Amino acid sequence: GVTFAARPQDHSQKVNKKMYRGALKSILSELVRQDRLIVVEKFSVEAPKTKLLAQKLKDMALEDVLIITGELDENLFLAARNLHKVDVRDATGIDPVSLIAFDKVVMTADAVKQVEEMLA
Amino acid sequence: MYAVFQSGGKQHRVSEGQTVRLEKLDIATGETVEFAEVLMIANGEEVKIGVPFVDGGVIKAEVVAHGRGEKVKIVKFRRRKHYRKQQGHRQWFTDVKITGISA
Amino acid sequence: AVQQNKPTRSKRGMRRSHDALTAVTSLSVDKTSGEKHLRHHITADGYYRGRKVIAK
């Protein structure tokens, strides 16, 4: 055998809610201080085509970015599932690790309202 | 003619044009140094120190380079007592060429 | 009856030093057959000191 064999162990830590929310407040403030955050009103496209999405990101001069929405669009999520450097998410489903990892973050203004309401 | 002097807490006999390794000094590379604490000058006829530090005696020397010596090992070991250490050391040296001998 | 330490390569050489082969290098040539053989021993061709035996 092994001298001390391994067991299926849960590595789930416990995160305090205020610590989590303060980390997110600080992480977005540091994104703004790094000038890595852009806010617009509308961001969508009415066809499920990665060609159109990549052309729009070229027109916006964007390479490794993070999309967040007010509410979620069928074609927008379909157009960036297959794009590795781009993740499209609802404003509820956020993580600080992907808030760091992607080079710039772009936000719907309704999503900004939902985030600032959700943090308070 | 040869000279005997005191440099690094260690006395040294030298002739004129000889290269001598010594301890570390704060002097630069191309700077000329002097020594007025000479103990002995000799020829067919010699002049030694009676009391130390020869009157007219001076040694002019030129620093050539600085460096660190050959690395040596330090091993400490107590048998049967569960204790051993090891260390390493290199000693800083300055190489000089002895230019001038004067009395 | 058995040892208490392990012997060496050097001891093994010092013991095997004399256990080494000495060749003959002293061969004799038959006059008649024009071949060589051991001294006092016959050829494969039935010759010894010139004269003749079986030569099978």
Partner: protein, 117 residues
């Protein structure tokens, strides 16, 4: 995760055997014996770096005593003569002089005589 040990073990063993080249037999070939003799070599190194000073000083004193008795005086009276003549020449340089230039040593002896009497 599981970690294997071969490369790092081979590195340490190879380093000790590198330090133990030129030793007799298993002292050069076998870790369990070479690792002892390198540590013992460290002990003897740590000792003999001190003992060089004693051994060379008694060599120097032997040569000075020999040359002083050649010039007609003892080592003890000679060193006392140098201390009363206020002479700070050490035994390394005095040994080198007493080998090479005899006449300089003879003059130093004469100064020690004049400082003694």
């Amino acid at each position: 995760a599981r970690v294997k040990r071969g490369v790092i073990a081979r590195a340490r063993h190879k380093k000790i055997l590198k330090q133990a080249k030129g030793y007799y037999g298993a002292r050069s070939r076998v870790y369990r014996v070479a690792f002892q003799a390198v540590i013992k070599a460290g002990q003897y190194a740590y000792r003999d770096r001190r003992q060089r000073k004693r051994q060379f000083r008694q060599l120097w004193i032997a040569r000075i005593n020999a040359a002083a008795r050649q010039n007609g005086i003892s080592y003890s009276k000679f060193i006392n003569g140098l201390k009363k003549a206020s002479v700070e020449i050490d035994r390394k340089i005095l040994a080198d002089i007493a080998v090479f230039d005899k006449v300089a040593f003879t003059a130093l002896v004469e100064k020690a005589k004049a400082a003694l009497a």
